[model samples]
Target: HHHHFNLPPGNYKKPKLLYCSNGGHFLRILPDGTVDGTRDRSDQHIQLQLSAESVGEVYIKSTETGQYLAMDTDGLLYGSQTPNEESLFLERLEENHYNTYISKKHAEKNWFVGLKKNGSCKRGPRTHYGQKAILFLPLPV
Candidate 1:
């Protein structure tokens, strides 16, 4: 005998994830209190949040270099090199950054989180650059 399960359409919900591509630009503010020009490195990625119900993941590639990393949902923690490599955990801190946790016994390090811009500095792409609400995962001390 075969058992058939029927569920309502509303019962299922789509997953929420962030994705970006070529149009994204990086605005770097130097330590000298000066804002550096934007760079079009063509970086792209998808971030996922890991949880009991769902694990968050971010898949990104640099168009200029073809380098990428798969980051776990904890925002900046739990990452691994792409195409079958060792697992490298990361730690997230304020000011939008993530630090690498090298060895299993070592502590996690801090690294900056990159933001995306939309246009040239002179032209001023006001629509693209602004404050955004983002999800973050707490780091394990």
Candidate 2:
């Protein structure tokens, strides 16, 4: 049953810079596996290689650090060395032409990948679909 869905088809093979609609920041993965958002789009750490696993399912890996962006059950965002259940994220294209990464590991909890107003990572539980904090634009790197 290949029914139509709201999410649009996107190019996931190339590297992308996740620009957060909240604080106008780009998602970055640090050397210590810490996740944060920065205003610098030129930052190499902001480039992410999205590995598409299935329909709308992807594992976000930092192009520089080679770490996968993962959300824990505690709603914490981190970079994992390997792809696991916690590393799986559902890439949802919102109506506003932006995207939201929903935590597949915490699907029942409805956790979203979000950044704070101060360009810091926000706990997943603190985010939702409609909020600007959880909206992102996948920009070409």
The lDDT for every candidate, in the order shown, is: 0.24, 0.85
| Runs off by more than 4 Å, candidate 2 | 1-5
For every model shown, what is its TM-score relative to the native structure? Answer: 0.22, 0.93
lDDT of 1 by residue, 30-110 (tens): 223222223333322222222121122122222223333332233332223342222222222223432111111111322
Q: What TM-score does candidate 2 get on C-alpha atoms?
A: 0.93
Model 1 RMSD to the real structure? 15.5
Q: Give the best candidate by TM-score.
A: 2
